[PDB]
Symmetry: C3
Subunit: 51 residues, 3 copies
């Protein structure tokens, strides 16, 4: 009758699944942001020079 | 006497809670960073043009 | 014979460990990205002024 433990496992599994998905999305978005940062930095270095 | 399992559940629950909180904070900070990137890109596109 | 529960715990522990590691790496990378954003913004503010 100790199925309290299994219900909790099911809850943690579910939470963990959402976390995993969130993480993947945050990694993708950050990879893109970092590339934009890198590009911007390089554009700026140039503008600085042409002045 | 197999309460070893429940202690472990409690540990994972706790770990998961900190992860969730961390994720939320990282999402907020990234959303802000991305907007700054977007703004910067647009400012730069202009400077490039006015030169 | 209900060792099904322990195997699941072991799986969640393992998943959680990878998540934790991923999070740490994403936090580091974001901290760096944000600093680059901050720098870029300030470089740009200046260029805007010198024009």
């Amino acid at each position: 009758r100790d199925q309290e433990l299994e219900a909790r496992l099911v809850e943690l599994e579910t939470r963990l699944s959402f976390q995993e998905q969130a993480l993947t999305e945050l990694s993708e978005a950050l990879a893109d942001a970092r590339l934009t940062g890198a590009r911007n930095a390089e554009l700026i270095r140039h503008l600085l020079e042409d002045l």
